[PDB]
Structure 1
Amino acid sequence: TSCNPSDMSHGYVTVKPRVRLHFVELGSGPAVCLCHGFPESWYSWRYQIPALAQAGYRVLAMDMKGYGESSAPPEIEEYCMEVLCKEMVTFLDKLGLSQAVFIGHDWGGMLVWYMALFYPERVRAVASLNTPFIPANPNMSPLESIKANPVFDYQLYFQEPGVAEAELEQNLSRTFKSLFRASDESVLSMHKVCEAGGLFVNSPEEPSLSRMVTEEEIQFYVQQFKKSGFRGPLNWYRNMERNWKWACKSLGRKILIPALMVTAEKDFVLVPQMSQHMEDWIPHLKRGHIEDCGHWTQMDKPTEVNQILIKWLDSD
């Protein structure tokens, strides 16, 4: 069902002087590049990697920039979509891949949509878990839309360098145990986070283990976030204006490659209806939907995700 880390092939590509990307590689056939969200790991794909490899695909599961064994420079702007996307292009180039299928989740989903938008020639097909494609509005700056949405208040808590880092870094076991839970097991404070104290303030000093994860799984994440901590990961969130500026340069060009949007019923931040008018911009869009599935889609509902991904990969 899953991956044992020391049993994988581990690859490293230098995409620029400062920066190498690590990834794990399994399988033969068309290249499928898996891109995780915040605050995750290649390992978040642990149930998909063997499944897609067995279905006849060559899987490359990334540590995204800021995570795991990939470099984690401290500057905020090293994590804007524009920089991350160019770097993913160089990654392909150095591997001698002219294209790959890109599949992302959360921030990885965002990334893959912008890859499809700006580098369609390098993207065979694109799929997102939970993250919709929303075209930028040149009259709506990002900070206004985020204030309108109360469940997005945690993104404001993430802006100030050092603040979310100190809470997240305080106790890594507690961090991951409090984050990685089914929606019904969650006690995260998302709505008035700065004023509440932080994300974890109404959550135990020793949380129980979610039914989704084992202690061993939790400890792999703990160990992975020792090397660089949370700064780079959090920087993904600190480029809103820059990313908005870059997206407005699309100037309504349309994604024409095959595309798959998978929504999760119980993701309370990336809610299904935020995807609702994607076919106005991607008319051939295909969809999948997973009941009883929270934010941590690949872990919560691995069987359903695998089924949806393999069916789509095999047809489009």
Structure 2
Amino acid sequence: RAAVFDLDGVLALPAVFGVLGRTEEALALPRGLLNDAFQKGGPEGATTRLMKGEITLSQWIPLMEENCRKCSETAKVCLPKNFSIKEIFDKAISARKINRPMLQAALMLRKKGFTTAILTNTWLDDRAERDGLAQLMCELKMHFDFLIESCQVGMVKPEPQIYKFLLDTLKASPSEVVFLDDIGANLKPARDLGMVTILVQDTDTALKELEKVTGIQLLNTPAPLPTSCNPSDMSHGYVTVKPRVRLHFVELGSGPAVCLCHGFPESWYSWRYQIPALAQAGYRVLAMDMKGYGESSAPPEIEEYCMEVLCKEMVTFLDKLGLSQAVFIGHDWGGMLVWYMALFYPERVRAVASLNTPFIPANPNMSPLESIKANPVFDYQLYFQEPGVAEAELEQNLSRTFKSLFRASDESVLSMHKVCEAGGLFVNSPEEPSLSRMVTEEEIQFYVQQFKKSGFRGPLNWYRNMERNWKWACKSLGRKILIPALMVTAEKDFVLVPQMSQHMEDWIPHLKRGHIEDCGHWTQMDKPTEVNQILIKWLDSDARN
């Protein structure tokens, strides 16, 4: 089973074709005058050549004007002064945006096994403002198995040849595929070939028919999760920051550089729901494997993971990439790292944002051990101190380790208080952990394979530089954070609790805030939609400026 969608009038509205109507009604020109000069000559006509890839759009612009002159001459009328055909088409193409509900339908269909494809009559766009069209196509493109464009295949969609091409591309019998189009003429051939068709007038009715014939709930369906990341479809970057320390990252999009720093014990993949969203919002996302994780190097020495060397290496990372600046968004331990980036390298940080992780200034008086002991929820951090112990139980069963950890506010299974002395992190934890509703088995197996490379030594070493970090932090006790800064709290995070951030204003006067209801500690995958809304909104106003 497969599904095929037209672009104009189906996956994109308002249909550009419907500008040759508006324009007439607006200029009070004779009904059809435009849509006639547009199709003048039929197959031999300029527009058909334009659509077959014989000529470019800019080449076509003049041809359409001559027709409009010769079309209004026979109709015995005359177009105004600065009647601009380019002007009309510019705002028409620009006005046309994605049909979100129709895209959802395609998504679900594909999610449930359908081969999806876009088949459109279109042109080679060489306009000065062609990038707008290319941006839309890229966004749509990614969601379909195939994109067949008339100007690329040299065929045009009324012609029966392109339909045989479609099926050949799809590897499917006509009877096996649905075909949606806003133009009836372009429906016949598919119908005649024996495949299901749907004249698309209003979107919801078409989806009714679609849902109707597919036996799949498409309409009124729940709000979907943001687009995720298939690891092997990603651009992977590698930078050596030191004799034998190499950092790995995934990169997507263009615009201001946004560096995403995950926490413990995670990876770049923990940003899977925001990487596409932020790129889409006009940003260049660099999602890190922090030192010790995934494809980044993982040196055994503890001091390799104190905040001073971690931050210095991040600075070197920008250096090697030719970046004077980046916005740093961190979560958990990454959030900690991000606050220190802000305090120690303001020149390098376009803006700082933390998820869950508050900024707590060091206490010059109390040892970082007294202070951490002074919090019952941080009992497992004393457990992490002795090298090898925590590694052993965390590395013993990887799938179990993550299935236990990566859980929602409710479905917890870990006794996080009284951990070390009562045994370990998984004292009375099932050795057969249920699958969280936040994660599929596949996503868990990704973290499993990642951690098979270096294990937990490196990650745990982040916990073993308390006295070093404390000494370093004490240097910044006279400083304030005065660059754009955003703190986001998660209600149900029971160790990185919202209340811990209550005093941050003192140190970060212009601090902007965000908060998420019923969100646990794994913010990115727990509430991806709201997370994306909050960061994208904050970037637009504080990062791009």
Runs of 4+ in 1 over 4 A off after TM superposition: none
Q: Whole-Å Cα distance in 1 between the matches of residues 518 and 456 of structure 2?
A: 29
CA contact (8 A) 2:261 2:334 kept: yes
Is the 1:189–1:196 Cα contact (8 Å) retained in structure 2?
A: no
SS in 2 for 1:190: coil
The alpha carbon displacement at 1:257 in A equals 0.3
Instruction: Give a deviation string over 1:245-289, Cα, whole Å, max 9, x none.
Output: 000011321111000000000000000000001011111100000
Offset from partner CA, 1:175-204 (integer Å, 9 cap, x none):
000000012111212111112211112221
Q: Give the deviation of 1:221 after TM superposition.
A: 0.1
Summarize the alignment of residues 79-158 of structure 1 with structure 2, pairs less than 5 Å apart: 79-158=305-384
Q: Distance in 2 between matches of 1:208 and 1:105?
A: 25
Q: Match for 1:23 among 249, 256, 261?
A: 249
CA distance in 2, matches of 1:160, 1:248: 25
Alignment of 1:66 onto 2:292: yes
Separation (CA, whole Å) in 1 of partners of 2:301 and 2:342? 26
Answer whether contact 1:31 1:101 (CA < 8 A) is retained. yes
Instruction: Provide the rounded CA distance (Å) in 1 between the counterparts of 2:471 and 2:449.
Output: 36
- Counterpart secondary structure, 2:250: strand
Q: Distance in 2 between matches of 1:63 and 1:72?
A: 11
> For the residues of structure 1 that align with 2:408 and 2:311, how far apart are their CA atoms?
31
Report the Cα distance in structure 2 between the residues aligned to 1:173 and 1:182, rounded to whole angstroms. Answer: 17
Q: In terms of mean alpha carbon deviation, does 88-97 or 245-254 score higher?
A: 245-254
Q: What is the deviation of 1:44?
A: 0.1
TM-score (norm 2): 0.58
The separation in 1 between residues aligned to 2:477 and 2:231, in whole angstroms, is: 42
Pairing 1:249–2:475 present: yes
- What is the DSSP-based 3-state SS (H/G/I as helix, E as strand, rest coil) of the residue aligned with 2:277? helix
Match of 1:69, SS state, is coil
2: CA distance between counterparts of 1:164 and 1:93?
Answer: 35
Q: Is the 8 Å Cα contact of residues 135 and 247 (structure 1) preserved in structure 2?
A: yes
Q: Is contact 2:361-2:477 (8 Å) kept?
A: no
Query: Structure 2 CA distance, aligned partners of 1:216 and 1:48?
Result: 18
Are the counterparts in 2 of residues 255 and 282 from structure 1 also a CA contact under 8 Å? yes
Partner of 1:185: helix, strand, or coil?
coil
SS at match of 1:209: coil
Is the 2:490–2:498 contact (alpha carbons within 8 Å) kept by the matching residues of 1? yes
Contact 1:9 1:25 in 2 (8 A): yes
Moved more, 29-38 or 182-191: 182-191
- Greater CA radius of gyration, 1 or 2? 2
Aligned to 1:185: 411
Matched-pair identity in %? 100
**What is the Cα deviation at residue 140 of structure 1?**
1.8
Q: Confirm or deny: 8 A CA contact 1:264 1:290 kept in the other structure.
A: yes
**Alpha-carbon distance in 1 for matches of 2:268, 2:496:** 21
Distance 1:307 1:127 in 2: 14
| Whole-angstrom distance in 2 between the partners of 1:214 and 1:203 | 20
User: Retained in 2: the 8 A contact 1:68–1:224?
Assistant: yes
1:229 is matched with: 455
Alpha-carbon deviations, 1:117-169, whole Å to 9, x = none? 00000000000000001111211211011111101000000000000000000
- Could you tell which deviates more after superposition, 129-138 or 77-86? 129-138
1:46 Cα deviation from its structure 2 partner: 0.1
Equivalent-residue separation in structure 1 for 2:507 and 2:397 (angstroms): 43
**Is the contact made by 1:189 and 1:198 (CA closer than 8 Å) also made in structure 2?**
no
Q: Deviations over 1:31-81 (max 9, x none)?
A: 000000000000000000000000000000000000000000000000000
Q: Over aligned residues, Cα RMSD in angstroms?
A: 0.6
Is the contact between residue 380 and residue 419 of structure 2 (CA under 8 Å) also seen in structure 1?
Answer: yes
Q: Partners of 1:241 and 1:266 in 2: how far apart?
A: 29
In the alignment, the residues of structure 2 paired with residue 239 and residue 291 of structure 1 have an alpha-carbon distance, to the nearest angstrom, of 33
**Residue aligned with 1:40, SS:** coil
Question: Tell me, what secondary structure is at the counterpart of 2:452?
Answer: helix
Contact 1:154 1:193 in 2 (8 A): yes
Cα distance per residue 1:75-102 (max 9 Å; x no partner): 0000000000000000000000000000
Alignment of 1:202-221 (within 5 A): 202-221=428-447
2:335 alignment partner, SS class: helix
* Structure 2: tracts of 5 or more residues without a match: 1-226
Whether contact under 8 Å (2:362, 2:477) holds in the other structure is no
